[PDB]
Ligand binder design. Structure first.
Ligand SMILES: Nc1nc2c(ncn2[C@@H]2O[C@H](COP(=O)(O)OP(=O)(O)OP(=O)(O)O)[C@@H](O)[C@H]2O)c(=O)[nH]1
Ligand SMILES: Nc1nc2c(ncn2[C@@H]2O[C@H](COP(=O)(O)OP(=O)(O)OP(=O)(O)O)[C@@H](O)[C@H]2O)c(=O)[nH]1
Lengths: 728, 728
């Protein structure tokens, strides 16, 4: 039933009785402890349990209670005096352990744990019924034994009515969501089991009507392009975004947050902007970019908020900013001053990315009670209708429990401490790399308050925003369109730069170490990074990291550093990519490959085109709306055209290149020269360098000769007129 | 207490306060500097301190820190901003100087420096007690004043417990050895104060049992013949070595590194080779020969390693190859792929020879953790037992400190730069001699990559192995048994050839300048060479050389060159050898002596016999094992026989001639015809040419008539049977 242990110190052992559960000593993390029982003088053990801020009941056995220190009494929960030693002490300690476990276990997981504890004969869905189908076949038996009995036993459905209703929100299911809603300072919370992709489908399909204007962030994820525009029929008013010589996904231009530019831009419909106090139904802004650019949510609401009915913050790459005091301005759920003239705030966040949750788990935080009595408001009936279009009728319970448990894990002083201790570890790890003069320098300011970054106090830096800010016009970040106190460096994204770029002069250096070499090296040495662009590599930071894990990373980056400065053979450095492509990289050394791979991108001015794709001057021309483009795609009014003949052709699918991992030509838009240039460079790179090829979606490769040519689905007006189905 | 100075530039002088220590200007080597304090714009002074890679803290006083260059910030350690000028700046600078001195001073020397700083009344060992006995007598007072107070004050013992234990390895003593062990990439490091001779006694007496097979390199030093065979009782399986027409100590034959030849050769014991996977307990190979032949340690382990439990690399003539990137393949401590089927690696190196250390200082690097759980492994208890047989109970502390300091001096980018800068100096000095068409040509390849040696870029040549390699079958080196990528030219051995030999045709030229004339000339002009063979002279290169010292050498070799090509009197050229042997060299001129001394060796075919002594076809016959031979020597079962009657007689002592400086007839072996020929030539040379006589050990000279005849201790079977002590 219960698994919580009692941690007691040696002298305190023979003073209590709950030898019902495993008692242990103190030198523990206190994560499996129910109640700590020490002596009044064993101050350091009482201080250690208290320091974790978990809230574990501390029992102090004393000789003189009237003599105990006042500061220690705040840490002690109950006093076991010696001025009776009985079975009543055994009750208090057991009741403390029970009241504690009732506290740390969230609403839905607590019920799932109890339900599974019963011996219930399942004749309902899922058909495997407690995994008993799997253990009847050898392939399934291997599947059962790999995962364990529990994941199959916890896989239940609506017919197990004791657990509530996960669709029309009833029972322990809604209790879990109402708990998360308190933890995140929101009106209502919706648990989505189809990732932020389907949560993005929920938000927009609930608010956007065919023809409504959407204030679109050009950095928006494919799901926001597909749902808000292609599916729903919304019409975008794109806001240009920043990009530096590293191709980093920066925020929206400061000059774009101007009402006069926005209304001018909104000439998609002349009257919907001309007088309408609020020309936009929805405004989707990506709060946290992949490359570490987190906005000032307070300043965004203040500047574009009175023009939008609703504002959606795709916060899938963040979420932790609510629990880190330093980053409060970045949290849209902590905005106090909301009244009826303000917009409704929706916050979509992928719990699995940088929070605690299984893959595909996400949630929506609705904060719009301040606009409750107006026509623009979207009530629970309206929102849940959309939720149910995307939510399955048979959701996976263990995934629902993960979201429930995450909300508990972020709650109070125990969750905030975990993010705080991580900052200490991350700040100390960056200092290690800076002080050790590594060629892989962390993307942070070089000088803060007249002193060097690494010369600041780690504790201050964990709670001082000056150390993590993108100062207007500062050379290091090189983003040309940032204002004062508008963007911040996301501290949880261990972003390292690699040689080859000089943000100072805004151009390439003679020698460069492409990030893909670093990526493949670490992958061969067991370390799996998140991604690597052309001159940067990323590692995601959550409380799962320990100083040991970071040191094991910093070590392997110092090994590769010396193998490069001394010029080692490619068979030695990268043996996986060699023992696959031998006759192509024969006799090569790392520097030989490094100079080769660097010059290709250098001679092609790859970062100049990477920047232009997100600049209004170079946005493709809209030859059709995204909705109209998808309809033509459904109707098969298309042709596969190669890239050399594609410029000017209307793209029916979004061209997605990595980097930046965002649409460069949205469906309906016609292929710009800039789009064709950038795609041709990466196409040639796939051919020229097998093994260090960038990921690319929206385009289709066809092997033609010795090279692999790129194609794309484009509109065919000939098939449109020669189709009697939708009128000749 | 502290002796480190602060180097500051003029403009920066009135901005700080540590007028506690001597402040100086920048135009310094930075070897006595604690902290460099310049201005942000004084880029060339900031760049100069950084270039030495010592790691000195650079303080940059600035007007605008936000404006400083990014590339310069990597060099600057701390920023002293002007946007307070106080006593806090004086703290940071003092703490930097202290943290720096704590860094560059190694573990044992740091403690010795502190201990000596105290006023301690010594009543223990050594009896001179701080040299106070010496200053009580006139002879000792002259000794005290010649060396100084410190060398006597630092001479302490075990009773000064604060310094640790140098025998059972405790305190700062083991800290020093654990530091060296990290610097040399080894498991454990043993500091030997009895030279590599006693370190060679340590290694073999710890591993070799009476009767064990030792894979013996015929080039091995006398200490390896004496300890492994004569003392321990190991039985050799000799590997033939290469010798060219210059009598240069080359490496082992390529064809000898064959398992089928080795097992066939190992028929010392038929079953110990027949099936034994590992027939050898120890294998001693001389990694770096005196004449500049350094092996490929990686290829040696790959070819004979699975046949030996352990392999010892007598690296006394090298060691610097670990710190010179170009020579990585020559370092047995940098081998990565070691598992349980590989042998244990021991590396003995004389720190005094070509590293930084006093005479008699050496160390052993043990790298055998990869074979830890097997019967063949020799743990710290076993090894330290041997260490203590040879290590004294009263070691000299200053010598221990020298080894400690050497490890610090080879550590990081500061030590590697010193060896790198030396290569530049040595490459440039060789080019001077080649381009100036000297008769003393440096032993290097004449043509590398289609261009002449001297026509290559000095920087490339310092990090390109092609310029320093013995190509298979190339005429210049004339070694007949080398394979591909097996041997390299040791760049730190300034080896010059003298006229008289033609490696092309493999024979003598008409005219020759014997190396001993060059040796005695330079010695009279103050320049002390290392050695001189018959047609070659050597100078040892360590970071102690400056381009000035080399130019002073090249000059004196150009002076002797013209005195030879114009034929100058012998009283003019060599006045030291003349004013001792006047009536013998009366009226002689250098060319008269040169032709005479050359023809003697030419008509005797001296290089043909020098080659044969290290060829298996001409190895002496083993008439007794080395151990048995020494026992007979102890028992006085011997007779002094002259060389004319010695052929066939069992040598009880090793015949050591210079050249090559290696045993030609090991104890137990019977005098070969080749041995008698070569020794007779050198014997006649002592008589014929007084003043240019080669050094010779293992043989005893007796003045008989007008000539000095050579004798040798040989076995007397008559004394053996007429001795009732060890049975009649
Ligand atoms: N998903 C979700 N459902 C909730 C939550 N809180 C309450 N509910 C469900 O919402 C129902 C109430 O919704 P409605 O009947 O529309 O009442 P309402 O909350 O006033 O609706 P609004 O007009 O949007 O304020 C409850 O009966 C619950 O089943 C929450 O945090 N999350
Ligand atoms: N000379 C020397 N002694 C060392 C070094 N490192 C540790 N020691 C000494 O070796 C002792 C430990 O040796 P053992 O007790 O045999 O433990 P061990 O190191 O596991 O021995 P192995 O079985 O050889 O691994 C330490 O207590 C030190 O005194 C080193 O680098 N050099």
């Amino acid at each position: 039933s219960s698994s919580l242990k009692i941690a007691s110190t040696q002298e305190a052992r023979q003073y209590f009785d709950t030898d019902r559960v495993v008692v242990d000593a103190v030198g523990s993390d206190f994560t499996d402890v129910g109640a700590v029982i020490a002596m009044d003088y064993e101050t350091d053990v009482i201080d250690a349990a208290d320091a974790t801020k978990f809230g574990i009941p501390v029992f102090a056995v004393t000789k003189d209670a009237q003599a105990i220190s006042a500061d220690e009494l705040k840490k002690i929960f109950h006093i076991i005096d010696l001025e009776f030693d009985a079975t009543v002490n055994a009750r208090e300690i057991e009741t403390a352990v029970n009241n504690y476990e009732d506290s740390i276990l969230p609403p839905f997981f607590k019920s799932l744990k109890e339900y599974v504890s019963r011996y219930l004969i399942q004749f309902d869905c899922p058909g495997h019924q407690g995994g008993q189908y799997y253990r009847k076949h050898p392939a399934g038996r291997e599947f059962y034994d790999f995962f364990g009995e529990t994941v199959f036993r916890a896989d239940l459905c609506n017919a197990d009515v004791a657990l509530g209703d996960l669709l029309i929100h009833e029972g322990p299911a809604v209790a879990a969501e109402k708990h998360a809603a308190r933890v995140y300072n929101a009106d209502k919370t919706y648990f989505v089991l189809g990732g932020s992709s389907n949560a993005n489908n929920t938000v927009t399909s609930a608010l956007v009507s065919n023809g409504d204007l959407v204030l679109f962030d050009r950095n928006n994820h494919k799901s926001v392009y597909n749902s808000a525009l292609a599916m729903a029929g919304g019409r975008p008013v794109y806001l240009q975004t920043n990009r530096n010589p590293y191709g980093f996904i920066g925020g929206i231009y400061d000059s774009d947050f101007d009402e006069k530019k926005i209304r001018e831009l909104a000439a998609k419909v002349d009257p919907e902007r001309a007088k309408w106090k609020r020309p936009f139904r929805l405004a989707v802004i990506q709060l946290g970019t992949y490359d570490g650019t987190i906005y000032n949510a307070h300043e965004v609401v203040k500047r574009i908020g009175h023009l939008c009915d609703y504002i959606e913050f795709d916060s899938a790459w963040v979420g932790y900013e609510q629990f880190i005091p330093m980053m409060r301005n970045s949290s849209p759920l902590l905005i106090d001053d909301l009244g009826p003239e303000d917009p409704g705030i929706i916050v979509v966040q992928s719990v699995h990315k940088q929070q605690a949750g299984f893959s595909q788990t996400s949630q929506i935080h609705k904060k719009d009670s301040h606009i409750k009595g107006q026509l623009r408001y979207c009530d629970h009936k309206h929102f849940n209708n959309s939720f149910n279009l995307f939510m399955s009728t048979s959701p996976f319970y263990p995934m629902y429990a993960a979201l429930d448990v995450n909300a508990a894990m972020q709650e109070g002083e125990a969750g905030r401490k975990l993010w705080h201790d991580l900052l200490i570890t991350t700040i100390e790890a960056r200092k290690k790399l800076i002080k050790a003069g590594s060629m892989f320098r962390p993307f942070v300011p070089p000088v803060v308050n007249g002193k060097k970054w690494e010369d600041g106090d780690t504790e201050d830096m964990a709670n001082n925003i000056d150390y993590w800010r993108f100062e207007k016009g500062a050379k290091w970040h090189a983003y040309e369109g940032y204002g004062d106190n508008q963007y911040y460096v996301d501290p949880n994204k261990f972003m390292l730069t690699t040689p080859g770029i000089n943000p100072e002069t805004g151009d390439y250096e003679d020698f460069g170490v492409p990030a893909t070499i670093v990526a493949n090296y670490l992958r061969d040495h067991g370390i799996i990074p998140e991604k690597s662009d052309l001159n940067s590599i990323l590692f995601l930071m959550t409380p799962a990291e320990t100083p040991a894990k970071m040191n094991n990373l910093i070590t392997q980056l110092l090994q590769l550093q010396r193998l490069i400065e001394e010029d080692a053979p490619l068979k030695q450095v990268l043996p996986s990519i060699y023992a696959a492509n031998e006759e192509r990289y024969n006799g090569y050394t790392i520097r030989e490959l490094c100079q080769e791979l660097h010059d290709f991108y250098k001679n092609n001015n790859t970062f100049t085109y990477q920047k232009r794709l997100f600049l209004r001057e170079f946005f493709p021309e809209q030859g059709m709306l995204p909705y109209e483009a998808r309809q033509e795609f459904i109707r098969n009014h298309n042709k596969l055209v190669p890239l050399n003949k594609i410029e000017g052709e209307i793209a029916l699918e979004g061209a997605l290149p990595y980097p930046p991992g965002v649409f460069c030509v949205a469906p309906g838009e016609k292929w710009s020269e800039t789009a064709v240039k950038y795609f041709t460079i990466l196409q040639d790179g796939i051919n020229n360098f097998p093994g260090f090829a960038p990921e690319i979606q929206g385009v289709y490769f066809k092997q033609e000769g010795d090279k692999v040519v790129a194609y794309g689905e484009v509109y065919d007006a000939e098939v449109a007129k020669n189709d009697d189905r939708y009128n000749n």
